[PDB]
């Protein structure tokens, strides 16, 4: 769970 703001920080 918990989708990040951006996949590739």
């Amino acid at each position, epitope marked *: 769970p918990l989708q*990040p*703001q*951006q996949p*590739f*920080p």
Partner: antibody, heavy 123, light 112 residues
Framework: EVQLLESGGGLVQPGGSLRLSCAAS????????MSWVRQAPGKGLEWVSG????????YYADSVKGRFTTSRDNSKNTLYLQMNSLRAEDTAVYYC????????????????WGQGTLVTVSS | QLVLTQSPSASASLGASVRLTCTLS???????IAWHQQQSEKGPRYLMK???????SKGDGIPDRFSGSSSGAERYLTISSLQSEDEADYYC?????????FGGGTKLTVLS
């Protein structure tokens, strides 16, 4: 608006190498993470790699890890995909793309696609 | 396991409506997805994003007859007054930490 223009596709022997380029325009390139996506003939879209805005962090699908490397030049505003040890099953149309994720607001949350370039690995 | 589940094919009549379904795997019901359209032998075109509260973020020039919606773990794309040009493969797409994930795509046929 945003434009992503790819080049560098072609025919390569198995075990050979090839580098794809994606020339970006219409936005501050260095602000955004950039991705490569591919599509084998008659198959669906498959994620290949991502690279952070600064270039400090790279991410790869397991099927290409260790053979494909992504880099970027934030003055030429160009994204690259360096392929070594290419295999027959790497044959595909390769797309550069800009996926904005979330945290953005209006049109800044749009995604964009390059036009694709065909890479054929064959003897 | 972050997975997007799409039916392989769908069809509806010319001028009617169709809704395509994208299903998020358990534990990811809060995830944002995007819809991309790919006509046969063309490159993909981004359509919009769909989060839990529905919403959009339409690409430039995407008609109003394209809309999206959300309910639970399912994400929808609804196309009304179907035209021949709407025949295409529709991919939902999402992301997690350090990965992108694509559904298998839904190929839409507009009959008659």
């Amino acid at each position: 608006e945003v434009q992503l223009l790819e080049s560098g596709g072609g025919l390569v022997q198995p075990g050979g190498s090839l580098r794809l380029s994606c020339a970006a325009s219409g936005f501050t390139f260095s602000t955004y993470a950039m991705s490569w996506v591919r599509q084998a003939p008659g198959k669906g879209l498959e994620w290949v790699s991502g690279i952070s805005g600064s270039g400090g962090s790279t991410y790869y699908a397991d099927s290409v890890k260790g053979r494909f490397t992504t880099s970027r030049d934030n003055s030429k505003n160009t994204l690259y995909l360096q392929m070594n040890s290419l295999r027959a099953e790497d044959t595909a149309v390769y797309y550069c793309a800009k996926f904005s994720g979330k945290d953005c607001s209006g049109t800044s949350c749009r995604d964009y696609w390059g036009q694709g370039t065909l890479v054929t690995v064959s003897s | 396991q972050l997975v997007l589940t799409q039916s392989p094919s769908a069809s509806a009549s010319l001028g009617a409506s169709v809704r395509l379904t994208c299903t998020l795997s358990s534990g990811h019901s809060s995830y944002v997805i995007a819809w991309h359209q790919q006509q046969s032998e063309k490159g993909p075109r981004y359509l919009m994003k769909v989060n839990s509260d529905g919403s959009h973020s339409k690409g430039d020039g995407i008609p109003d007859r394209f809309s999206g919606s959300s309910s639970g773990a399912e994400r929808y794309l609804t196309i009304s007054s179907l035209q021949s040009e709407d025949e295409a493969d529709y991919y939902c797409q999402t992301w997690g930490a350090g990965i992108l994930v694509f559904g298998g795509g839904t190929k839409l046929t507009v009959l008659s």
